[PDB]
Amino acid sequence: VASVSKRIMHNAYYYDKDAKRVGTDSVKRYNSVSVLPNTTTINGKTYYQVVENGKAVDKYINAANIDGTKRTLKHNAYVYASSKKRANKVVLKKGEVVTTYGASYTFKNGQKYYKIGDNTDKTYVKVANFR
């Protein structure tokens, strides 16, 4: 079957066609998985169907961990590499659209951050700056 390599942008569990998790393992960022090119919808959410050993299997990865999610900033936001370290001097402005990858991360400061940027760089934005 036709397969395409997709980079995992956020630690992703495997799910079956019933939105229930498959196994205890998880594919870690930023590794690559082979999936079907066209996407599918489970419970309204977008998924990729995993291809293993040349055949499609009952394993699905949430597309938010591959394609991400286009979000709009409601505040001006800095780009962070950790809780206290700034990643650069980029200042994202209110109204700009940014793609975030996967569920938010809780840093050690207690606040929650979104991984941004289609790359492997430690670039995070506070969730409180979105919606």
Numbering used by the authors: 314 to 444
Paper text:
S-layer proteins (SLPs) are self-assembling, crystalline proteins coating the cell surfaces of many prokaryotes. We determined the atomic resolution structures of all functional domains (I-III from N- to C-termini) present in the three S-layer proteins SlpA_ac, SlpX_ac, and SlpA_amy. The Lactobacillus S-layers are anchored to the cell wall through interaction with teichoic acids (TA), either lipoteichoic acid (LTA) or wall teichoic acid (WTA).
The SlpA protein (~46 kDa) is the main structural component of Lactobacillus acidophilus ATCC 4356 S-layer, built of two domains. The N-terminal region is involved in the self-assembly of the S-layer, whereas the C-terminal part is involved in the attachment to the cell wall. The amino acid sequence of the C-terminal SlpA_III domain is sequentially conserved among Lactobacillus. It consists of two adjacent repeats of the “SlpA-motif,” the “Surface layer protein A motif/domain” (InterPro: IPR024968). This domain is involved in the binding to TAs (teichoic acid binding domain; TAB domain), one of the components of the bacterial cell wall. The crystal structures of the TAB domains (SlpA_ac_III, SlpA_amy_III, and SlpX_ac_III) reveal high structural similarities. The general structure of the TAB domain consists of two cell wall binding motifs (SlpA_motif) which are connected by a short linker and arranged as an internal homodimer. Mapping of the surface charges indicates a large, highly positively charged region within the interface of the two motifs that extends to the C-terminal part of the protein. The four residues observed in the vicinity of phosphates are conserved with the proposed binding motif of YxY….KxxN. SlpA_III, the teichoic acid binding domain, is not involved in the self-assembly and protrudes inward to the bacterial cell.
